[PDB]
Amino acid sequence: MAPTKVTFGDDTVIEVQGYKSVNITFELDERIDKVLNEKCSAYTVELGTEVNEFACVVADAVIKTLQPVSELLTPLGIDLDEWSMATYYLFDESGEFKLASHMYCSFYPPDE
Amino acid sequence: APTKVTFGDDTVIEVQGYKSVNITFELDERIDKVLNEKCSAYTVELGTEVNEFACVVADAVIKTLQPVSELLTPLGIDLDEWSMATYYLFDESGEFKLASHMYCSFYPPD
Amino acid sequence: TASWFTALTQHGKEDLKFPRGQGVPINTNSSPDDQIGYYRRATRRIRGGDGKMKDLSPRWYFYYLGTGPEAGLPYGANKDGIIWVATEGALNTPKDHIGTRNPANNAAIVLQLPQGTTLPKGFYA
């Protein structure tokens, strides 16, 4: 979004934007999670982003990371066209849907 | 310490980053509400350890209660004991992790 | 698909329990016919910053009689991590019409209970 304008004095304007450095541990399929952790796990996120919208960013990133190797994944049992249609849960180490420096990405919600 | 950012035209801004923490007290059901109203809101340097923050919350409790110590002793509450107990801060999952909402207790959580 | 309501979190040794009549969450778009169902204890196991699996505080979710993960259970069925609640005048009938909550289309209602109801030691606000 828009940098916040904070004003001092007669005419000074400070523009401030806030970000969280998010590192995702992927937990989608153990046989490929480590490539995901290496390729598309670092993000810089605006502190006001809704997590279900950040989720969509992460989703698009694993599909974009995985299209090139889609044919090595079908033998494994992994269909990206069904992965691309699935719900990505993002949550912190306490299982809360809250931006955090470290988050988990899973196909199954934290409460079970 | 506040970070100094220096701009053109000899303009310097000091910036400091915090987390808003609201405590829900669970020390003694009879006074928990006044603790909630009077010393529950905190502004905490980002990255602060939960242990250091507990000392801070513990101090605010004593500070808040001492001007009414004489009214608590009839309730069975000795602020000198309170003054020297361990205070437990934990988040909505039972984790000793700084968070926007935490609980304060004399006993570790579940 | 999820609980229509948010969860009660157990921070003490003692399971969720309600006196007869008490415990059904408040929601309009319900006649007194519908004030019956169960709470189901969820398990939340997440790995910590130290890499070890953590058992996080249990969350209890209400579902209407005949809905959700234990829609098959009859009211009063004795089973671990299930408790039953009914407001007087509720009807022993599946609440199919109220169904479950779809998280895309609807945010979960905050669970509030009519003031006066008893929560076990260990459950907070």
Numbering used by the authors:
A (entry chain B): 0 to 111
B (entry chain C): 1 to 110
C (entry chain A): 49 to 173
Sentences from the paper on this structure:
CoV-N protein is a multifunctional protein that plays a crucial role in the viral life cycle. The N protein comprises the N-terminal domain (N-NTD) and the C-terminal domain (N-CTD), sandwiched by three intrinsically disordered regions (IDRs), namely the N-terminal arm (N-arm), the central linker region (LKR) containing the Ser/Arg (SR)-rich motif, and the C-terminal tail (C-tail). In particular, the N protein interacts with Nsp3 to facilitate viral replication and infectivity. The coronavirus nucleocapsid (N) protein interacts with non-structural protein 3 (Nsp3) to facilitate viral RNA synthesis and stabilization.
